[PDB]
Amino acid sequence: SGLENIAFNVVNKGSFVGADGELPVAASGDKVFVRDGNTDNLVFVNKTSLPTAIAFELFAKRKVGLTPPLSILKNLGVVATYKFVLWDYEAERPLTSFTKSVCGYTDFAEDVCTCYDNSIQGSYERFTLSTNAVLFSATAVKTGGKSLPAIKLNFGMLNGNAIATVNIKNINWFVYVRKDGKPVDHYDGFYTQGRNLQDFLPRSTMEEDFLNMDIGVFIQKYGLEDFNFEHVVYGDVSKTTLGGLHLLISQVRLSKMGILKAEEFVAASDITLKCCTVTYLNDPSSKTVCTYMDLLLDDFVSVLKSLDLTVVSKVHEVIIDNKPWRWMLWCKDNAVATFYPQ
Amino acid sequence: SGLENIAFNVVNKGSFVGADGELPVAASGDKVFVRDGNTDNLVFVNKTSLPTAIAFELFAKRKVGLTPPLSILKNLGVVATYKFVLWDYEAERPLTSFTKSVCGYTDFAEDVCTCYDNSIQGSYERFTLSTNAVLFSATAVKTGGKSLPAIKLNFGMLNGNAIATVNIKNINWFVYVRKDGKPVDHYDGFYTQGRNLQDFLPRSTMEEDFLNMDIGVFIQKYGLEDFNFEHVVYGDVSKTTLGGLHLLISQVRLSKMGILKAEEFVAASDITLKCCTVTYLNDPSSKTVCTYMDLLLDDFVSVLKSLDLTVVSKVHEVIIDNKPWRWMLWCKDNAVATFYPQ
Amino acid sequence: SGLENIAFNVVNKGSFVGADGELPVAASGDKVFVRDGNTDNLVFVNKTSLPTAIAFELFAKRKVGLTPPLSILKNLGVVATYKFVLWDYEAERPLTSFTKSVCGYTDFAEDVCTCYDNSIQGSYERFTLSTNAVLFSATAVKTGGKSLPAIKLNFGMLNGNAIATVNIKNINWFVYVRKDGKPVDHYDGFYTQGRNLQDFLPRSTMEEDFLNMDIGVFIQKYGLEDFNFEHVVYGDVSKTTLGGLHLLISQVRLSKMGILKAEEFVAASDITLKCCTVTYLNDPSSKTVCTYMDLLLDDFVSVLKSLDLTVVSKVHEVIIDNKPWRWMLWCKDNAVATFYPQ
Amino acid sequence: SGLENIAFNVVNKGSFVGADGELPVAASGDKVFVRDGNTDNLVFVNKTSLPTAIAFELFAKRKVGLTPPLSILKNLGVVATYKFVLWDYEAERPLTSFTKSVCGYTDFAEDVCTCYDNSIQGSYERFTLSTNAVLFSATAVKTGGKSLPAIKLNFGMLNGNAIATVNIKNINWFVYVRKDGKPVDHYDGFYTQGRNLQDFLPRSTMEEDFLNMDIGVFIQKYGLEDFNFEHVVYGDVSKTTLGGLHLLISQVRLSKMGILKAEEFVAASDITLKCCTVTYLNDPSSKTVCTYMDLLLDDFVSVLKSLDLTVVSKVHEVIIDNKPWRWMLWCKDNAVATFYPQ
Amino acid sequence: SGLENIAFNVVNKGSFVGADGELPVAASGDKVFVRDGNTDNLVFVNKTSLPTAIAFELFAKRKVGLTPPLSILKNLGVVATYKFVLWDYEAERPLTSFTKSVCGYTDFAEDVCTCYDNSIQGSYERFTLSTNAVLFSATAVKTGGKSLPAIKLNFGMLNGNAIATVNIKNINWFVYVRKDGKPVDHYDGFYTQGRNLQDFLPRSTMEEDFLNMDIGVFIQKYGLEDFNFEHVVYGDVSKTTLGGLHLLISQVRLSKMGILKAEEFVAASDITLKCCTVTYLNDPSSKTVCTYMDLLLDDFVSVLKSLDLTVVSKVHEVIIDNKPWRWMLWCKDNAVATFYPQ
Incomplete structure (x- = not known):
């Protein structure tokens, strides 16, 4: 009105x-x-x-309040939201330029991959009829007594702040895809956590341990000797060009040690692969193009412990937020030398 | 909505x-x-x-459509309009920055000189109760069988175009003032016509005659020999500095003779005293500050024929659009030498 | 110039x-x-x-430099400031859109509730003549009686930063009202402190103790057992919907325990009743509409210890920054259940 | 102030x-x-x-008021004006981005080719000392009866309107150059007239005749048979691609015959070589890139009658507004085929 | 492209x-x-x-990445950069409005004091030919073993972040001036460090000691008893008007003690003499115009220990960033009373 x-x-x-x-x-x-x-x-x-x-x-x-993470929706080709908008609080910007039944100026009449919020009367029905569409829901979806194959998230956002299942508090999102006129069978892969450098909180014992323990102690405890963790995750601040450092949590730890700046190429909270220019003041080091993802540290390790350390170079495909990502692996003497995305 | x-x-x-x-x-x-x-x-x-x-x-x-002229309303100290706005089509701009019951953003809550349109339910009643206010009406206003003392106009505007009573077509506005808590007794003076150089149409035989006749013939016909009409109204384009030219109709006539430019200091259709820089190309002449009014030529003449031609200089006060205006009169040998506003 | x-x-x-x-x-x-x-x-x-x-x-x-708090001025209906402007450093904005004798474009000629700064030549005289006006000064007005009922403030701002009487350093403002042509008799109530979440410093032993002590220990020391302080002031972060949390100081304490976001509905430092969306990351909890005020903790307590715990629901009127505010009180078994504004 | x-x-x-x-x-x-x-x-x-x-x-x-033409000043490399600005009324824009002693924001401290207005106290003195500079004046500048020789103009502008010596009214500008530390000896060439399509007035009997006479009659009177005037100046509207038409006056004449549009590439009144897209509605014809200059018709003709009609193609250099301009000449059987700038 | x-x-x-x-x-x-x-x-x-x-x-x-400090370049009168731009990350703005061979819109054709980056092919050659110019280089520029002498910096910036030679990591810039057609003989003075209040890191044992030690202990260790360090560098927060406080490091130390705000007059990272309004909340004190420089504490002290403590007032000239700066010195009984720039 x-x-x-x-x-x-x-x-x-x-x-x-x-x-x-x-x-x-x-x-x-x-x-x-x-x-x-x-x-x-x-x-x-x-x-x-x-x-x-x-x-x-x-x-x-x-x-x-409680919202589903953004990058997965973007990755599933979402073009417009139906009767709500998803705000990217980091970029300051709706998820896309387009809506349906929200606002005349931005409404997009043509049939297209639309995202539906199950909490909103009638969105499920419109979703099921669609050739391409995405549905998210605080709970699961069924027909029978038995249900629907699903993307299952145990974390989410809250007014644009990252939150996780955590005293005993359940954070769940159920995300469903229909494509080329039919349900998607199954959903593989890992999911980025949507945290940021300033507000990062650990979500696993292994993450707690990464931030709190000594390097050698953490590596030993989790059996990471053949993965160049000191380079790939801890980051090597010993030369003017800062080595490795390819997770969010890498930055988090290093900024506890000293003054670390991370300048994002394009501010956004709806993107999977991230990238910044990173500078460490105390032991002057920086990396102009520093790719990284906020993977659950367990999942990243799980990926490492499935790599072949015998090749000199392969490109591995990892499924993250529903998309294949190209990760370059250089190995040497049955240990990892480098492991990075692109 | x-x-x-x-x-x-x-x-x-x-x-x-x-x-x-x-x-x-x-x-x-x-x-x-x-x-x-x-x-x-x-x-x-x-x-x-x-x-x-x-x-x-x-x-x-x-x-x-049909609207009352603007400069009179402005001159009566109108601060806001009630339930409508008056558009100055020339300046492209409401009459003032303020309304009442039109638009939240511009509404002006405080009691102030408000202008009411009688065609709008209830505006008359609010007008009568006010300490200061103006009312306009397509017709007169009474209490008794006998009426209300009034500003009576026989011309007006139509979608920002000047129109006059004119085949037999009546253009009337009745404008009423209440001030310091009571009706204004009576209304003296003349009213500017609100025409422009491009669209000027004559509204009297005398105006028809001014545009159509030879100078000597027009002057003789109306007995204007002692008023320096050739200077004051016709304009003297014989030196590089263009003399006199102090009515709208002056420009109208001269632009029939050749290429005349008139550059208004401040574009507006709600002002009485006007002013421009005027340039005549054919016989190169210009006047940087050329004051003028669009007075009915009859009224202007009527003002001339009430002046004392025996003084060397007086300042005369003329009532135009409800306001006293200072007109300077230089005389010489019982004829006018110059007659201009300010 | x-x-x-x-x-x-x-x-x-x-x-x-x-x-x-x-x-x-x-x-x-x-x-x-x-x-x-x-x-x-x-x-x-x-x-x-x-x-x-x-x-x-x-x-x-x-x-x-040194300036009076803003929300009281706004609350006293101040429309314009005479020969200075008061800057809201939080909103980035003068206190109002109007001045007097400051700037032509913003000057407001009409008689209206004006604020005078006593440090400026002649302001007191103009103030005393006014039908409605406010006066503030570092010192209090005297005359045998003698002072002039003034809302003695023992805190203030300093280049937009909150400061208090505090080693021994006096921060005083004297604020006087004239209304409907005569001095205001007397001034009741409490004053908001104008601090923010990031820069908050305690101003009383009780405040020091609220921030430093355990919950049970603080409650016992101040005899707060019948006031649901754990809900009303401490805040209850145990459900997804964060309970109570109705003072600035509440946020201050909770942000010492973990990562607390507070997103103000409208940024301003000249308003009494405040409001934000509040999110707690560590034990995921948030409240969309979270009303609060920065009351001195002593004063708020003082208000609690004057409530009737026998009613089921009353609305209490509390005087803060010279204005009645509606505070809702739910009681149960002679203890406070909920106590919030609106 | x-x-x-x-x-x-x-x-x-x-x-x-x-x-x-x-x-x-x-x-x-x-x-x-x-x-x-x-x-x-x-x-x-x-x-x-x-x-x-x-x-x-x-x-x-x-x-x-009365101002010197602009394109010549621009052509003499003028960079800044001293204690005034020259306004281009057509482009709505000062002659350059730079002034001296006018406005702090646009003042240009460095020694550079400055233009001085002789009417302004002290400008002549500063001009004479300069290494590069231009001076204009309504009175010839002197020396001992005789003179520093000048660009002598018998036309000018008046509040942005083109005006000429014309009943008997003298319009003069005297423009002086100093370059590489010394007066310029002498000044060759013709000068553009600065008129426009709408306000064009003839400045010569030949010009009067061009607008008023029949084509054959005009050509015969002035002995123009070997110059393809019907193409070069009259213009050829007989094909969909409109031929020749290389003077302002060409457009003026043609727009008397029917509806002619001339869309200037870049609006300006300070440029010698002009260009537009020109469209004739009545006998549909247009020329996308129509170069033209407003040359005194007598001067243009004077240039024609100094061409060699025996060559098949030469490029001729014509001095206009103090600058060499390349004019292409195609001849055929001792008559002009085409004559155009560039 | x-x-x-x-x-x-x-x-x-x-x-x-x-x-x-x-x-x-x-x-x-x-x-x-x-x-x-x-x-x-x-x-x-x-x-x-x-x-x-x-x-x-x-x-x-x-x-x-790695860039030379800005204020020195600005101080050497640099007007344009050749084939690169230097970004002021603090003000968000190129070092000047002008470039050469970077961007057509901002290119500055005229010969002027240009800055060259030795890392860029051909910049050294163009620099050497110039009448006025600056050259920077991560390697000393040579001559025959020996050298054109340079401004030798052991610190620099990294993506706008201040960094220093520091485990063993060398940060060097070599800056060369040509002026009035010839190399500058020699370069005196100290250099500002380009740090900020938030990201300040010590670059010397003395600096480490200033932040970490007690006041008396620090003063004794360095023999500073006759320099009013407690006022001049530590700052005096004991009155409402905060005394002295004329180094970046002064703010750094004080903000460790409590909440300190320093509002810069004009955000910039290319300026030697800095200034702000500084407010200390805990013991309310502020100084409206607080001049300061980020000098290496050792250099500042070195300047103190070369002052005459016998005069009552002298103005001393200190060379900082290649420029003379006026520092006022008030002395009393052979001890410094005050020492401040301007």
Whole structure:
């Protein structure tokens, strides 16, 4: 019921909930203001390529609180969301430029891979009829008494903050794909965790141990002697060009030791393969193009312990967030020399 | 009911009429667009200091078709309009920055000189109760069987075009003032006509005659020999500095003779005293600060024929659009030498 | 003496002090630049709805160093400041859109509730003549009686940073109201402290103890057993929906235990009742609409210890920053169940 | 004395004249507004790449009224103007991005080819000392009866309008060059007239005759039979590709016959060689790249009657506005076939 | 090869490296977006006074990784960089508005003081021929074993992060000046270190000691009793006006003790003399205009121990970053009272 009503919701409920009320609002350049008697309050700054009042609407209509991770949805070719929007809080930007039944300006009429939120009346039915589509759900989906083959997540986001099953608290997402007119049989692979350098929290004993233990002690405990962990995960800050360092957790640990900067090529929370320029001040070291992923450390190790250490170079395909990724492996004398994506 | 509904009205009815329907719209910088399937149509360009979507709303809510002239309303200290807006089509801009019960963003809560349109349910009643306010009406206003003292206009505007009573067609506006808590007794003076150089049409036989006749013939016919009409109204293009030329109609006539440019200091259709830089190409002449008014030529003459030609210099006060204006008169040998405003 | 002079002051003294000198300046979009020979330095970014050069001037003319808290001024209906501006450093914005004798573009000629700074020549006189106005000063007004009912503040701001009387350092503001033509008799209630989550420093032994002590120990020491402090102030992070948490200090303590995000609905330092979306990562918990105020913990307690624990539900009115606020109280078996604003 | 004072001058005197007074002004995007109590009036729209308040200042400080033609000044490599600005009314833009002693933001400290206005105290002295510089003056500059020789113009501009010596009215400019540390000996060539298609007026009997006479009659009278005037100047509208048409006056004549559009490649009034896409509706014909110059028809003809009609192709150099221009000449059987610039 | 190719490089390599590939890009306001199928990703936000696509190009063409400190280059009057740009990461802005052979829009044709990067083919040759120019190099420039003498730096920047020779890691820059047509003989003075308050790391045992030791212990160890170190460097937070505090390291130490804010007057990383408004919350104290420099503590001390403590006031000239700086010295009874720049 108009921008004045949406402003009322955003100011009083932090998002559009369908509350009654109006505030005077005007977009002006990339800013949204609300007239508060004798003062104009800034309530929104547009970092999208959309018109400001539009970006503001979509932000107000984002799914608030508990949300599914973004990169998987992006990876499944999601083009538009149905009756909600998913906000990338890191890039400041909806998941895509397109919606369905959200906003006239951005609505995308053509049949296309659409993402449905099971918590919303009728989205399941529209999803099942589709040739290509994705469904997510706080719970599983069935027909029979027995269910539907599924992507099962034991972590998620909360108002754009990374959260995990953790005192005993269950964080679950069920994500379903239909493609070329039929359910996808099965879902392989690992899932990126969606954490960031500043707010990183460990989600496994092995991760706890990586951050807390001495190097030799951690390597011994988990039997990693043939994987050049000191290079590949710990990072080698001994030359001016910083070696390896290819997980998020690598940065986390090293920044406990000293001052570490990581400058992301393109700010985003809906991407699997990440990349930054990384600088370590204390023992001056940097790597201009530092690829990395936030893989659960257990999963990464599990990948290492399935590699052939006898070849000199192979390219291995790892399935992460539902997509094959090319990881280069250099070996030497039955130990890993380097292991990196691309 | 939201910008999408207002866009629907503007695109299909040229203004907001309360039609049902929605078009996707977004302001972007100083432009308004409507999404037309695969194309964005530009429907509005903002030349106001207001936020673009706001300026667009107020424009959509302007009084359309037959309107009262603007400069009188401005001159009566009008601060806000009640339940409509008056659009200055020349400046591209509402009459003031303020409304009442039109638009949250621009609404002005405090009691102030408000302008009411009698065609709108309830505006008369609110007007009568006010300490300061203005009312306009297609017809007169009474209590008794006998009426209300009034500003009576026999001309007006039509979608921002100047129109006059003229085959037999009546153009009337009745404008009423209440000030310091009571009706204004009486209304003196003349009214500017609101025409422009390009679209000027004569409204009297004398005006017809000014444009059509020879100079000597026109002067003789109307007995203007002691008023330096050749200088004051016809304009003297014989030196590089163009003399006199102090009515709109002066420009109109001279531009029939040759190429005349008139560059307004500040574009506006709600101002009484006008001013431009005027250039005549054929017999190169110009006047940097050329004051002028669009007075009915009869009224101007009537003012001349009430001046004392015996003084060397007096400043005369003329009442135009309800305001005293200072007109300088230099006389010499019982004829006018110069007569100009300021 | 023009924008060039104001730029000179801002660049060399961080504000307009009346220093002589000039620097080439241009606003461009929402930015202000200074030509430094071969380089344009960005000196200001406009987050207000005012034109950029104008927002820049008012920022340059803000009261620098020691300043009174803002929300009380806003609460006393202050519309404009006389010969200075109060900068909200959090919103990046003058206190209101209007000044008096500061800047032409923003000056507000009409008689209205004006705020005067006693340190400025003549402000007290103008204040005393006013029908509605507020006065603030480092010292209190005296006259045998003698003082003049003033909301004696023992804390303040300092370049937008919260500071308190604290080694022995006095921070005082005296704030006077005239309303409907006469001094306000008396001033009741408590005052918000204006601290933020990141910079929070305790101001009382009780506050020191809330941050440092165990829960049971703190509750016992202050006899809070019947006030559900574990829910109302400590916060309950045990479900996905985070319970209670209704003071700034609540967030402060919880962020010492783990990673706590607090996303303000509208950034401002001139508002009394605050509100955010709050997320706790370590034991995943969040509250979408989390009302809170930064009350002195002693005062809040004092409020608790004046409630009737025998009713099931009452709405209590508490006076904070000179305004009645509705606080909801659910009781159960003579102990507080919930106590929150609205 | 500040933008407020400059706004006062522009609104009341149409330019900066040094009048006392202030109006609240604010640039906002590419627009400048003045607060007129309850209304923001648009007084300037920026079409320059300068910041808006700056472009507004330079416009206010332009030379008003009688001005020298622009393209010659541009051709003499003028980089900055001393204590004034020259406004290109067509492109809406100062002659260059640079001034000296006009505006801090655009001032150009380095010694460079500067243009001086003899009407301005001290400009002649600074000009004479310079290594490279241009001087213009409405009076010849002297020496001892005799003179530093000059570019002598018998035409000029008036508030951006083309004007000529013409009842008996003298329009003169005297333009002087110093280059590589010494007066320029002498000045050859012709000068473009600076007219436009809409406001074109003839400046010679030959020009009068070209517009008014029949083609054969005009050609015979002036003995033009061997110059393909019907193609080169009249233009050939007989095919879909419109032939020749290489003078302003060519367009002028043709637009008297029917509807002619001429879309300039780059709007400017400071350029000698012009170019447009030209379309004739009545007998559908167009030329995408139509080069032309506004040469005095007598001068153009004078150039024709100094060509060798015996060669098949030569490139001739013509001096126009103090610069050599390459004109291509195709001849056939001792008559011109084509004659065009480039 | 076009903005699309530059976007490809920035998104995939974090800068322009000459990689092949294209991404659709568009600047819009002060933002640059890349079309990623169904989504527009924000890749750059313009904080410069240049047009956005241009600022974006210069950023992509910055020197990446190991770079020379900026303020010295600025101090040597550098106007343009040859075939690279130096990015000020703090102000978000090239070092100047000008380049040579980088970008057409910002290229500066005229001979002027140019900076050359020895790592770039042909820059040394162009540098040597120049009348005024600067050259930097990670290797000393030679002559016959010996050398054109240089500004020798044992510290530098790394992707905008301050770094020093430091396990054993050499950070060197060699900076050479030519002026008035000939090598500069010799280079006196000290060099600012380019650190910031947040990322400050000590570069000397004395610096280590200043941060870690007690005040008396530090002063005694280094024999500083006659230099009012407690005021001049430690700072005096005991009054509401915070005394002395004239080094970066002063802030660093104090912010270890409690909450210290330092608001820079103009954000920059290319300036020697710094200045801010500094506020200490815990013991409320602030200094509006707080001048400071990040000098190696050893160098500052070295300057102190070369002062005459017998005068009451002298102004001392100190050479820092190749420039004389006026430092005021007040003495009293053969001990320093105050010592500050300006």
